[PDB]
């Protein structure tokens, strides 16, 4: 990732309004609903049979806050994502076997959640800057596969 | 596309509140801003060199309006997308040579614009439904390549 | 898939020189080795910790044969793949949750295997004909998702 | 990109046995033939209308050697593809506007040509290693986009 001071400032500014506790659960639950093959990594979380089953699932919600916490930390360390995600990359690639494409899907779901939450404040250059970050994060997490 | 009537209905209902015109200009503009290589197809439209340049371009607005109108048409003819887009596919594949991936990015930008616009009424199952449609359209447009 | 009769014939003739035994197993094994996340689907098959383990795995070799088997049968119905594969589609989408992307990676390995196997006979237009087919098979298998 | 001691040596050895004239013209022609939309970047080259047109075209064979030429450096600097490819990245992203997906397609064609060009020395581990290289090169050329 290479953001201009203006992109970075825009990015960190909007992120500060984010209720991660909330956005985390919405992003992960929407991933499971929209791209249903992703449910396979979470088959032990219980009932993932209906959109309601997914969205209010306590394990889904709890996990999404975790994922989002890691994301916030990538945002503060844009200069060393590879470093920052070093151990998470070994976990996902080596142990979990998460397809790199799935990281791209969650990135896109997150963008859509931000749009949904911020409406108007989520401008084209803000979306463009967010796309660069999510691609950057996806890249750092699939690191162990490169 | 496989839409449950519950899905067909939720889709239909919401498209009914869309401002095609506007959403069209928004979605097209955001594509060019977010996925800058797509500007190559619209070099003849004027200045696209700044996000402000892009969003301001009346050729971009007009065109996105044309794009969405075709979209509205695929929505009404969900069981005949290949036939409905017959003519558009030849144009895009044979003359313009639009990469199939680009149809997919536009579908993505369009889902984000509807989120951005509908906020709260843009629920997971609606998102899931729109996601199926957008994929169906992209597939129908790239058909000449298949 | 729209193949010219010249394309259909080139497809048919090369296929007729293929040992599905040897190819199915080689392709399935190369998949697991080159795109390691795919192994997640085959944990019940035994050890896949090494390439050698992968390529040597009899359930792999044997699963491969079955996969090419099915393939060979869409070939006879390039006319209707969605219908040929309709039932394997429910299985993979509904029961197995195989990412659409995985189908495309297998299509890629299959193509590389043919190239590797029929060097100079695998000409540009023959390649072009096989890409349309593997892409057609992948879309047919991912259809329940659409 | 990270290669095993072994993977590295196996990569470098096979490369010094490569006829870049041949591989370069074949990789580039195959790309144009297999994914026809790519023909839009080479409008300047003349007749690309047919596989024979394409494969016959010396502007094609000539650029293919240039492309592969650059690919060769990359290889001597696997530790810094990002740095090695920095200025080509600026040309491709800022000037030519080549979609990042196109770099991936060329990468794939390229691995197909190597398989075709070495049959049997192109083992599963060799493939895996070239796949990691090709992927790293594609990412290093799309670098100016993120
Ligand atoms: C933005 C990208 C992502 C980030 C930052 C992220 C972050 C995390 C974190 C912080 C953990 C917990 C590690 C621990 O156990 O402390 C985790 C675990 C996990 N993640 Fe990821 N994740 C991402 C994307 C994904 C995707 C796309 C999937 C699959 C579709 C996935 C599947 C999992 C699973 C299955 C676990 C382990 C769950 C468990 O321990 O029961 N993650 N992730
Ligand atoms: C996926 C949904 C899309 C729809 C429904 C759509 C629809 C249309 C329509 C209705 C036209 C006007 C036809 C005419 O010339 O009479 C058109 C033209 C065009 N479209 Fe598409 N389009 C889509 C995607 C794309 C994408 C993703 C791109 C490129 C990045 C693209 C590039 C163009 C160009 C360059 C033109 C012609 C402009 C000119 O007049 O020079 N389209 N499209
Ligand atoms: C695109 C070409 C493919 C074809 C034609 C195909 C076809 C088949 C067939 C014929 C079976 C046996 C079904 C039965 O027992 O009735 C099967 C099972 C299976 N396939 Fe697919 N397949 C393809 C790709 C894939 C991919 C890419 C993956 C995963 C990476 C995959 C994962 C599986 C699994 C996990 C099973 C069940 C194996 C078991 O019994 O443990 N397949 N497939
Ligand atoms: C392996 C990935 C690639 C490498 C290493 C590469 C390398 C190069 C090099 C070395 C040049 C010549 C620069 C100069 O002397 O000015 C060039 C130019 C060019 N490349 Fe790339 N390239 C790659 C992929 C692609 C792809 C996939 C496309 C499009 C589909 C593309 C389109 C072009 C075009 C249009 C030019 C300008 C040729 C002209 O003078 O008309 N390249 N590339």
- Euclidean distance between CA atoms A25 and A61, whole angstroms: 4
**CB B9: neighbour CB atoms within 10 A?**
12
Nearest C-alpha to atom 7 of ligand 4 is from which residue?
D67
- Shortest distance between the Cα of A45 and any Cα of chain D, in A, equals 34
Q: Do D99 and B99 touch (CB under 8 A)?
A: yes
Distance of CA D5 to the CA centre of its chain: 23
Contact C63/C29 with Cβ under 8 angstroms? Answer: no
Q: Do A34 and B108 touch (CB under 8 A)?
A: no
Residues 6+ apart with CB under 8 A from B122: A116, B14, B114, B115
DSSP string, A69-108: HHHHHHHHTGGGHHHHTHHHHHIIIIII---HHHHHHHHH
Contact A140/A79 with Cβ under 8 angstroms? Answer: no
- Which residue of A lies nearest to C33 if distances are taken between CA atoms? A145
- Euclidean distance between CA atoms B63 and B41, whole angstroms: 12
Question: Hey, what are D110's tokens?
Answer: 């390229």
Closest by CA to B67, choosing from B31, B118, B120, B121, is: B31
Contact A84/A73 with Cβ under 8 angstroms? Answer: yes
In the block, which residue shows the tokens 């729209």?
Answer: C2
Q: How far is the first Cα of chain C from the last one, in angstroms, to the nearest whole number?
A: 17
Contact D39/D28 with Cβ under 8 angstroms? Answer: no
Nearest C-alpha to atom 37 of ligand 1 is from which residue?
A96
Closest by CA to B85, choosing from B27, B146, B44, is: B146
Closest by CA to D100, choosing from D145, D39, D50, is: D145
Closest by CA to A87, choosing from A42, A146, A24, A141, is: A141
Cα angle A117-A121-A126, degrees, rounded to a multiple of 5: 100
- Euclidean distance between CA atoms B146 and B58, whole angstroms: 34
Residues 6+ apart with CB under 8 A from A116: B115, B116, B118, B119, B122
- Euclidean distance between CA atoms A28 and A106, whole angstroms: 7
Contact D132/A146 with Cβ under 8 angstroms? Answer: yes
CA distances from B144 to B80, C125, C138, C140, D95 (A): 15, 17, 17, 17, 29
B117 is an annotated ligand-binding site residue: no
Q: Which residues of A touch C (CB under 8 A)?
A: 36-40, 93, 97-102, 145
Closest by CA to C106, choosing from C23, C16, C7, is: C23
Closest by CA to C124, choosing from D123, D135, D62, D36, is: D36
Question: Hey, what are C44's tokens?
Answer: 């019940």
- Euclidean distance between CA atoms B114 and B121, whole angstroms: 10
Of A31, A70, A72, A97, which is best to mutate to test ligand 1, by the most ligand atoms within 8 angstroms of its C-beta? A70
In the block, which residue shows the tokens 């050729």?
Answer: B59
- Shortest distance between the Cα of A104 and any Cα of chain B, in A, equals 12
With residues binned 3-state (H G I as helix, E B as strand, rest as coil), the percentages for chain D, rounded to 5, are 85, 0, 15
**CB B90: neighbour CB atoms within 10 A?**
13
Contact D11/D129 with Cβ under 8 angstroms? Answer: yes
Closest by CA to B33, choosing from B20, B15, B44, B47, is: B47
Residues 6+ apart with CB under 8 A from D56: none
- Euclidean distance between CA atoms B132 and B136, whole angstroms: 6
- Euclidean distance between CA atoms B74 and B106, whole angstroms: 15
DSSP helix/strand/coil, A142: coil
Report resolution in angstroms.
Answer: 1.8
Asked whether the CA dihedral A119, A121, A127, A128 is positive or negative, the reply is: positive
A146 is an annotated ligand-binding site residue: no
Cα angle C9-C11-C17, degrees, rounded to a multiple of 5: 105
Question: Hey, what are A25's tokens?
Answer: 């659960």
Residues 6+ apart with CB under 8 A from A33: A51, A54, A55, B124, B125, B127, B128
Of C92, C94, C100, C113, which is best to mutate to test ligand 3, by the most ligand atoms within 8 angstroms of its C-beta? C92
- Euclidean distance between CA atoms C141 and D28, whole angstroms: 30
Contact C32/C60 with Cβ under 8 angstroms? Answer: yes
DSSP string, A110-122: HHHHHHHHHGGGS
Contact C82/C143 with Cβ under 8 angstroms? Answer: yes
Phi, psi angles (nearest 5°) of residue A91:
-55, -50
Asked whether the CA dihedral C63, C65, C68, C69 is positive or negative, the reply is: negative
- Euclidean distance between CA atoms C120 and D130, whole angstroms: 21
Residues 6+ apart with CB under 8 A from B28: B60, B61, B63, B64, B67, B106
In the block, which residue shows the tokens 């195989």?
Answer: C98
D21-33 in b/e form (b: 16+ CB < 10 A) is eebbbbbbbbbbb
Question: Hey, what are D115's tokens?
Answer: 């398989």
Contact B72/B24 with Cβ under 8 angstroms? Answer: no
Question: Hey, what are C81's tokens?
Answer: 């793949």
Residues 6+ apart with CB under 8 A from C62: C25
- Euclidean distance between CA atoms B41 and B102, whole angstroms: 11
DSSP helix/strand/coil, C3: coil
Helices (H), chain C: 5-15, 20-34, 51-56, 58-75, 81-84, 86-89, 100-117, 124-141
Q: Do A112 and B123 touch (CB under 8 A)?
A: no
Pick A101's closest partner by Cβ from C36, C97, C101: C101
State in Å: Cα C113 to ligand 3 middle. 18
Q: Quick one: angle between helices A100-118 and A124-141, nearest 10?
A: 150
Contact C30/D127 with Cβ under 8 angstroms? Answer: yes
* Cα atoms in the 13 Å half-sphere on the side-chain side of A120: 0
List domains and CATH numbers for chain C. 1-146 (1.10.490.10)
DSSP state letter for C99: -
- Euclidean distance between CA atoms A29 and A25, whole angstroms: 6
Find the Cα–Cα–Cα–Cα dihedral A25, A27, A31, A33, rounded to 10°: 60
DSSP state letter for C97: -
- Euclidean distance between CA atoms D116 and C122, whole angstroms: 8
Contact C88/C8 with Cβ under 8 angstroms? Answer: no
Closest by CA to D133, choosing from D5, D9, D4, D11, is: D11
Find the Cα–Cα–Cα–Cα dihedral B119, B122, B123, B124, rounded to 10°: -110
CA distances from D145 to A64, D92, D93, D140 (A): 28, 10, 6, 10
- Euclidean distance between CA atoms D99 and A110, whole angstroms: 23
- Euclidean distance between CA atoms C36 and A137, whole angstroms: 20
Closest by CA to C143, choosing from C105, C107, C91, is: C91
Q: Which residues line ligand 3 (CB under 6 A)?
A: C 38, 41, 44, 63, 66-67, 70-71, 88, 92, 96, 98, 102-103, 106, 137-138, 141
Cα angle A40-B116-B17, degrees, rounded to a multiple of 5: 105
Q: How far is the first Cα of chain D from the last one, in angstroms, to the nearest whole number?
A: 18
Neighboring chain A residues of B127 at a CB cutoff of 8 Å: 30, 33-34, 112
């Amino acid at each position: 990732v290479h953001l201009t001071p203006e992109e970075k400032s825009a990015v960190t500014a909007l992120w500060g309004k984010v209720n991660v506790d909330e956005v985390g659960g919405e992003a992960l639950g929407r991933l499971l609903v929209v791209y249903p093959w992703t449910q396979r990594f979470f088959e032990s979380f219980g009932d993932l049979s209906t959109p309601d089953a997914v969205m209010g699932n306590p394990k889904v919600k709890a996990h999404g806050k975790k994922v989002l916490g890691a994301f916030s930390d990538g945002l503060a360390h844009l200069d060393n994502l590879k470093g920052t995600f070093a151990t998470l990359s070994e976990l996902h690639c080596d142990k979990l076997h998460v397809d790199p494409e799935n990281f791209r899907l969650l990135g896109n779901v997150l963008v859509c959640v931000l749009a949904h939450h911020f409406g108007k404040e989520f401008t084209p250059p803000v979306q463009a800057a967010y796309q660069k970050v999510v691609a950057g994060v996806a890249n750092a997490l699939a690191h162990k596969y490169h």
